[PDB]
Amino acid sequence: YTYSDTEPMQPTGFATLTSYEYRDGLKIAMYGYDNDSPDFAKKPPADAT
Amino acid sequence: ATAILRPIGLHVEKFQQTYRKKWRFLTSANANVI
Protein backbone atom coordinates (compact mmCIF):
# COMPACT_ATOMS: atom_id res chain seq x y z
CA TYR A 1 0.00 0.00 0.00
CA THR A 2 0.75 3.68 -0.15
CA TYR A 3 -0.10 5.67 2.96
CA SER A 4 -1.32 9.14 3.82
CA ASP A 5 1.09 11.61 5.41
CA THR A 6 -1.25 12.83 8.16
CA GLU A 7 -2.34 9.24 8.93
CA PRO A 8 0.71 7.01 8.36
CA MET A 9 -1.28 3.88 9.24
CA GLN A 10 -4.05 4.52 6.68
CA PRO A 11 -3.63 3.04 3.18
CA THR A 12 -4.53 5.47 0.42
CA GLY A 13 -3.64 3.47 -2.69
CA PHE A 14 -1.41 0.73 -4.04
CA ALA A 15 2.30 0.74 -4.73
CA THR A 16 3.35 -0.50 -8.15
CA LEU A 17 5.86 -2.88 -6.52
CA THR A 18 5.08 -6.34 -7.87
CA SER A 19 5.40 -9.64 -6.01
CA TYR A 20 8.68 -10.51 -7.76
CA GLU A 21 10.11 -7.10 -6.87
CA TYR A 22 8.84 -7.37 -3.30
CA ARG A 23 10.42 -10.78 -2.75
CA ASP A 24 13.66 -9.66 -4.40
CA GLY A 25 13.84 -6.64 -2.09
CA LEU A 26 13.10 -8.83 0.92
CA LYS A 27 15.84 -11.25 -0.19
CA ILE A 28 18.33 -8.39 -0.49
CA ALA A 29 17.34 -7.19 2.98
CA MET A 30 17.85 -10.75 4.26
CA TYR A 31 21.23 -11.38 2.64
CA GLY A 32 22.62 -8.05 1.41
CA TYR A 33 24.41 -7.06 -1.78
CA ASP A 34 27.58 -8.36 -3.37
CA ASN A 35 30.82 -6.79 -2.19
CA ASP A 36 31.33 -5.10 -5.58
CA SER A 37 27.93 -3.37 -5.39
CA PRO A 38 28.12 0.43 -5.07
CA ASP A 39 24.95 0.24 -2.95
CA PHE A 40 26.47 -2.35 -0.59
CA ALA A 41 26.15 -0.24 2.57
CA LYS A 42 22.41 0.31 2.11
CA LYS A 43 21.30 -3.17 3.24
CA PRO A 44 23.23 -4.89 6.03
CA PRO A 45 22.28 -8.58 5.91
CA ALA A 46 19.74 -9.68 8.50
CA ASP A 47 21.22 -13.17 8.20
CA ALA A 48 24.42 -11.73 9.71
CA THR A 49 23.01 -9.01 11.97
CA ALA B 1 71.15 -43.40 63.28
CA THR B 2 70.10 -39.90 64.33
CA ALA B 3 70.18 -37.67 61.24
CA ILE B 4 71.95 -34.50 62.35
CA LEU B 5 71.39 -33.12 58.83
CA ARG B 6 68.78 -33.84 56.18
CA PRO B 7 68.25 -32.32 52.70
CA ILE B 8 65.80 -29.57 53.60
CA GLY B 9 66.75 -27.82 50.37
CA LEU B 10 66.54 -24.12 49.65
CA HIS B 11 64.62 -21.40 51.41
CA VAL B 12 61.96 -20.20 48.97
CA GLU B 13 59.14 -17.84 49.92
CA LYS B 14 55.99 -17.86 47.78
CA PHE B 15 53.55 -14.95 48.03
CA GLN B 16 50.00 -15.12 46.67
CA GLN B 17 48.18 -11.84 46.03
CA THR B 18 44.59 -11.08 45.03
CA TYR B 19 43.37 -8.01 43.13
CA ARG B 20 39.67 -7.17 42.96
CA LYS B 21 37.79 -4.40 41.17
CA LYS B 22 34.15 -3.53 40.59
CA TRP B 23 33.25 -1.54 37.48
CA ARG B 24 29.93 -0.22 36.21
CA PHE B 25 29.80 0.20 32.44
CA LEU B 26 27.33 2.01 30.20
CA THR B 27 27.02 0.64 26.66
CA SER B 28 25.30 2.20 23.66
CA ALA B 29 22.89 0.13 21.59
CA ASN B 30 24.68 0.93 18.34
CA ALA B 31 22.89 0.15 15.09
CA ASN B 32 24.13 -2.45 12.61
CA VAL B 33 25.42 -0.16 9.86
CA ILE B 34 27.90 -0.94 7.08
Side-chain angles (χ1 to χ4, degrees):
Chain A
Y1 308 135
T2 58
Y3 298 90
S4 80
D5 291 331
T6 56
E7 277 295 320
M9 312 283 318
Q10 186 200 330
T12 51
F14 296 108
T16 61
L17 192 84
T18 58
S19 307
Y20 300 135
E21 293 169 303
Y22 175 77
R23 289 190 294 265
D24 189 41
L26 181 52
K27 184 267 291 180
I28 303 163
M30 272 156 186
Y31 305 117
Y33 291 96
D34 287 317
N35 304 69
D36 59 356
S37 177
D39 297 304
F40 181 89
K42 291 174 70 175
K43 280 191 170 182
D47 201 33
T49 60
Chain B
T2 54
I4 182 152
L5 292 180
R6 292 199 64 265
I8 61 170
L10 286 187
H11 180 207
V12 183
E13 289 291 350
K14 303 219 161 203
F15 313 102
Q16 295 85 0
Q17 301 196 32
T18 305
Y19 302 97
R20 305 186 183 253
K21 296 291 168 299
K22 200 160 198 170
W23 308 119
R24 293 180 181 177
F25 291 128
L26 300 183
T27 294
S28 295
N30 303 313
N32 302 305
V33 160
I34 295 167

